[PDB]
């Protein structure tokens, strides 16, 4: 996960002002599951 939020404000006067926000978020989840069962039988009878 990431949050990356930035904010800037500005004003100038003898009048102009800006207040501004931009921020972007990422999420990831990988999930893994695995199974392997192997087997062998021999039976030799006399």
């Amino acid at each position: 996960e990431a949050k990356h939020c930035v904010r800037i404000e500005t004003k100038k006067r003898v009048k102009k002002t800006k207040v501004e926000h931009r921020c972007t978020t990422n999420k990831l989840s990988e999930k893994h599951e695995g199974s392997f069962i192997q087997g062998a039988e021999k039976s030799i009878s006399l």
Partner: protein, 50 residues
Amino acid sequence: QFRNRVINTKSFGGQCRKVFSGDGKDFYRLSGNVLSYTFQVKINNDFNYE
């Protein structure tokens, strides 16, 4: 393949050649010719599971 009848395996030759089969538990009459006929069992099992 097994093919057709070649030997007369019931030629008794005038003999009363009884044999007791312990397996079948019964008296059988052998032919006069047969060198031996016997009934001991062998059982021979391969299992192989994978």
